[PDB]
């Protein structure tokens, strides 16, 4: 596994026996995501939310087959006071995923 | 091109009926896929909510850990732990399409110094272990969710494309063949009237 | 084809039709009558109380709807799978399977209207109560619940 | 005249005849002979020849014939779905039905009338071929319900025996039929 | 079309036709002969063992079977896309255009029956045994195994 | 005879008539009597009958006639989302649209011909039910603009008055319409 | 259809066609005239300098190209997902919408030729100056910019 | 009469003529004039006019024409699966074939006949536009595999210099053509 979340958060990831990085800079982290797709760290990547709103960009540019880096829009510890709209993230999942803007 | 006959006309009517059955078949397939998408999305928001809870708790544990203990020694404890290789992904052959479900190895018995001279790296280790479990569960939930969603939009564009393309195309071919068969029938009933006049002329010449 | 002049004008004069299907005959069923394109335009006058029985029209309507939505579930399960359906869909599938080999596949047994409605309620007993929407609750309370392997109208 | 069976000659003999045998051109473009369109052919004599079959072919002959006919019907029913969606996205039983329909159309129905053997076929031989194809279908269907993969049944070596079963002579046909039937049960028993 | 009274009645008297296709002419193939609707009727009186060569009729039947599989699998490719094919289905789809670009497509060149039979065998080597279920075993034992890089260069 | 509207007879009739009232057998199967499909019917005499409506019914009668036609347009316009999902997951106002279209269907358009007093409905009674439905719609819309949830709008005791709006004699309709129109304003000012 | 004897023997004689589309009428647009299957086979004589205003042929050709692109990419994005598109794509979609909602749907009024040409320039000012490839720079300098919410 | 090239007069004149120039109705509704269907029209004088071409327009003129024709055929075969899947799943060259094909059918195969200078076109000017198009394709497909996006190769300022090349005079055209060849050869050296 691998993340590119924050330069402070990845220490606990390495403490869990798990590769993690940190840049906190969006274009530089997109470059790191490019070279991390290329050195594929066990097919699972978590990318920070307010570093890349969408993690899909590097894989949809390079690797249009097989979806090997499973990309997760992970959060960070700065917004661990509020969570920043879990269910709003699910509403944008539904709208991005089937095209239809519905609520309940 | 299409050969204008009566048999071709019944063939085009038959495959018009096949397309009108296929519209219903694909819409029932989409009505199943929608129900399973709505079944998966509540489980996805539950998994993401448990991810938020484990994120807050593991972040609190890590901040108190490297606040009371030194950041240097918890960094050394992080750099002493192996990367725990062997996390992998295998087949889920849903709708004839392999999607990778993921799980890790994570050995639990061989912890490096369970009597750890840092008294907070064990708690942070369990916290980020639960954090990585929450990540892999949200991972193999949402890749299934994204696959079901693109299958729904693929079926929907196939329904709309099949209707808006090859329902009026088959209807235009049927109408063309019917018009030219009516043309040939009208020519035949012209020739029969001409030959009836020529039968009648024999008697008026017989006189 | 029903656009030929002989069946077109005949159906334009007569009162409905009953239509043999080539599909049930090749499957092997006698008499091969599918009831989905068949129609008796003057049926509803000649049934009811004093004519056959009070539930005749509602049994006919419920069997027509249940078979008509069992056939497309049978067509649907080719691309989804048996386990990936609901409960009611598998119940309609078993209804269609039992229908077209105990109700249509008669052979040359002679059935009166009482044995025929007995087999019809034994077929409707497969579907659960409350899914039988088009039948009054009095007739459901009188006739729902009957085995197929007890009546021996078609064992 | 036009290739169409909607003519004053064709749809007059079609009324006054029994046993109608419609030849299509699509089965004759690919050299699949005889090009009998199965969907547009019939015979009104299958209920009068039943006691002769039960006496002079075998006792379970017409049930075997009716099962062949309903497998061809199930194939022709699934043809709509498989031509719309594709050969994949079927389940395994329906795919087995389509592949057994292929093996029937290629090994029982097809017959070239120039090979030395297989221009004539006694109905003991046709009964043996149909019995082998049904034994394969029922045991593969039972083996695929409990769970084995599709396309490892399509790779079995007894398909060569069922395929070449229409080329062997009628003299050594029981000595081939017993071996091929025992090979069907043995290959499905060793299969798991 | 074959439906018109002139070619229809012609094909009812005569014995065989060689039918040209406009579908192959726009691709740049000469002589543009699609082999499916064209048929020589009494081919079996002039072929076989001791007349040309003993493999000829079975080679003809297997060429027709494999190219008809390629032709009717092109429609399936057209309605499900390219990447959703099993193996041996891409092998039929490669047999089809190898057939159209090497067996049919020639120039003004005069090829005797041995060059034509070895090009037919070199195209049949693109399919493994067990799909070649119309050729017997001695023929497939003594002629199989030549690529297209040996029938010319 | 075919059930399709492209014979020469039906085309010439549609060219030379002034109104067309498409009965469909699906609505009588759904038990919607009379079975007039409104999505396929048309009437060209609407623009010419304007001053008779303006005098003998009310001066605003074509405007709420176009308003009810607008609501029946928009319900079938967004019918596809309801068919794909279901009415409980539409937003707020779209579920209000489908429910007011439902009350138009199950009260105004539907009519029992074998009833005592529902068999006939004059212009004043139709105008009364018409204004009642439209006033309930464009006051519950403002109640949603407050932020009131959809659930308390639907279960509400004044909708029984709009339900039995048509089972009322025209002797007693100018003693019913005023009181129901006061109840609508009262029960939508009593809410929050 | 145009393949009936009456419209094809009429189109063989006359000097153009104007086709009422059913799909415009279903949205309540009046008068429903889609400018794609319609043309005047003349009108290169009866427009231009001194007969109508001097920009007329260029304005008409630019409106036709822009609305044809708008309806074409409407039919494109109507099957793919509504994302994965650039910005002037969306400008062409909004041009097609405001075109068929203001320029076509006039609703029984006597628009002048100057009024309809300023409605045309109000719709053309919904696009950049670079995208107006068929209008010369003098007409871009004189015209190109109004408020379509003002002139209506 | 109805499009419909199966007419008696059309199929009677079709057997004898040596060039068939089919016009379309689906291609003249985009105002793409001249509306000659380039996939369905044909000639028979192409094999006979080759020595005149080789002595009077160029030396590689038939091969350049055949390359243009096979690009049009490739784009015509590719456009149907484009209408299937959209411009996404095209690989990389599948999209460059479309863009070069659109430059062909909007530069070479399109001619105004109302413009002052784009009404006549000698063989030299058509040959120059053909060399520009095939030079662009030949030197962009070789540059798309040195790591260049397809969404970079289109927005060059030289594509307009190709597109408006049919609006220059017969005298201005050679001095335009050699400078446009310099621009095409030099706008890919700086490409990265």
UniProtKB/Swiss-Prot annotation, chain A:
Gene3D superfamilies: 6.10.140.810, ATPase, V1 complex, subunit F. One of its GO terms (molecular function) is proton-transporting ATP synthase activity, rotational mechanism. GO terms for biological process: proton motive force-driven plasma membrane ATP synthesis. Keywords: ATP synthesis, Hydrogen ion transport, Ion transport, Transport. InterPro entries: ATPase_V1-cplx_f_g_su, ATPase_V1-cplx_fsu_bac/arc, ATPase_V1_fsu_sf. Belongs to the V-ATPase F subunit family. Produces ATP from ADP in the presence of a proton gradient across the membrane. This is V-type ATP synthase subunit F. The gene is atpF.
From Swiss-Prot, chain B:
GO terms for biological process: proton motive force-driven plasma membrane ATP synthesis. The keyword Transport applies. Pfam families: ATP-synt_D (PF01813). This is V-type ATP synthase subunit D. It comes from Thermus thermophilus (strain ATCC 27634 / DSM 579 / HB8). Produces ATP from ADP in the presence of a proton gradient across the membrane. InterPro entries: V_ATPase_D (IPR002699). One of its GO terms (molecular function) is proton-transporting ATP synthase activity, rotational mechanism. Keywords: ATP synthesis, Hydrogen ion transport, Ion transport, Transport. Belongs to the V-ATPase D subunit family. The keyword Nucleotide-binding does not apply.
UniProtKB/Swiss-Prot annotation, chains D, F, H:
Produces ATP from ADP in the presence of a proton gradient across the membrane. The V-type alpha chain is a catalytic subunit. Belongs to the ATPase alpha/beta chains family. This is V-type ATP synthase alpha chain. It comes from Thermus thermophilus (strain ATCC 27634 / DSM 579 / HB8). The gene is atpA.
Curated annotation (Swiss-Prot), chain G:
It comes from the Bacteria. Disulfide bonds: none annotated. Belongs to the ATPase alpha/beta chains family. Produces ATP from ADP in the presence of a proton gradient across the membrane. The V-type beta chain is a regulatory subunit. This is V-type ATP synthase beta chain. It comes from Thermus thermophilus (strain ATCC 27634 / DSM 579 / HB8). The gene is atpB.
């Amino acid at each position: 596994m691998a993340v590119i979340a924050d330069p402070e958060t990845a220490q606990g990831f390495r403490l869990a026996g798990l590769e993690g990085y940190g840049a906190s800079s969006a274009e530089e982290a997109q470059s790191l995501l490019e070279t991390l797709v290329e050195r594929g760290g066990y097919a699972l990547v978590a990318v920070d939310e307010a570093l890349l709103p969408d993690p899909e960009r590097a894989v949809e540019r390079l690797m249009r087959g097989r979806d090997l880096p499973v990309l997760l829009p992970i959060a960070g510890l700065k917004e661990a006071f509020q969570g920043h709209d879990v269910e709003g993230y699910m509403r944008e999942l539904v709208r991005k995923t089937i095209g239809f803007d519905i609520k309940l | 091109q299409v050969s204008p006959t009566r048999m071709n006309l019944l063939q085009r009517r038959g495959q018009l009926r096949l397309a009108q059955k296929g519209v219903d078949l694909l819409k029932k397939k989409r009505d199943a896929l929608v129900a399973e998408f709505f079944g998966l999305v509540r489980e996805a928001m539950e998994a993401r909510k448990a991810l938020d809870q484990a994120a807050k708790e593991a972040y609190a544990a890590l901040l108190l850990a490297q606040a009371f203990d030194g950041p240097e020694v918890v960094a050394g404890a992080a750099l002493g732990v192996p990367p725990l290789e062997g996390v992998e992904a295998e087949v889920e052959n849903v709708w004839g399409s392999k999607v990778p479900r993921l799980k890790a190895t994570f050995p639990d018995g061989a912890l490096l110094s369970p009597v750890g001279t840092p008294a907070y790296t064990l708690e942070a280790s369990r916290a980020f272990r639960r954090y990585a479990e929450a990540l892999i569960r949200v991972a193999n939930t949402e890749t299934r969710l994204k696959k079901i969603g693109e299958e729904i939009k693929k079926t929907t564009r196939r329904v709309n494309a099949l209707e808006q393309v090859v329902i009026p195309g088959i209807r235009a071919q049927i109408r063309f063949i019917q018009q030219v068969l009516e043309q040939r029938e009208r020519e035949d009933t012209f020739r029969l009237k001409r030959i009836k006049g020529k039968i009648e002329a024999r008697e008026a010449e017989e006189e | 084809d029903r656009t030929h002049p002989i069946p077109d004008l005949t159906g334009y004069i007569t009162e409905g039709q009953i239509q043999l299907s080539r599909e049930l005959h090749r499957k092997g069923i006698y008499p091969p009558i599918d009831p989905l394109p068949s129609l008796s335009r003057l049926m509803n006058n000649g049934v009811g109380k004093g004519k056959t029985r009070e539930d005749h029209k509602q049994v006919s309507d419920q069997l027509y709807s249940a078979y008509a939505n069992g056939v497309d579930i049978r067509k649907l399960v080719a691309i989804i799978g048996e386990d990936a359906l609901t409960e009611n869909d598998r119940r309609y599938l078993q209804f269609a399977d039992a229908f077209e080999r105990f109700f249509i596949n008669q052979g040359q047994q002679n059935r009166s209207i009482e044995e025929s409605l007995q087999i019809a309620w034994a077929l409707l007993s497969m579907l659960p109560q409350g899914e039988l929407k088009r039948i009054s609750k009095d007739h459901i309370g009188k006739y729902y619940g009957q085995k197929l392997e007890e009546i021996w109208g078609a064992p | 005249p036009g290739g169409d069976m909607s003519e004053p000659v064709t749809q007059s003999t079609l009324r006054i005849v029994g046993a109608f045998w419609r030849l299509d051109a699509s089965l004759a473009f690919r050299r699949h002979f005889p090009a009998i369109n199965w969907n547009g052919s019939y015979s009104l004599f299958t209920s009068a020849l039943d006691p002769w079959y039960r006496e002079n072919v075998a006792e379970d002959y017409p049930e075997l014939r009716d099962a062949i006919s309903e497998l061809l019907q199930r194939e022709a029913g699934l043809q709509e779905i498989v031509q719309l969606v594709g050969p994949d996205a079927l389940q395994d039983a329906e795919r087995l039905v389509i592949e057994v329909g292929r093996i029937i159309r290629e090994d029982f129905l097809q017959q070239n009338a120039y090979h030395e053997v297989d221009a004539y076929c006694s109905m003991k031989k046709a009964y043996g071929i149909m019995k082998m194809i049904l034994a394969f279908y029922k045991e593969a269907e039972a083996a695929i319900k409990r769970g084995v993969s599709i396309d490892e049944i399509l790779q079995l070596p007894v398909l060569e025996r069922i395929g070449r079963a229409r080329y062997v002579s009628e003299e050594e046909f029981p000595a081939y039929f017993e071996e091929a039937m025992k090979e069907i049960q043995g290959a499905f028993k060793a299969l798991a």
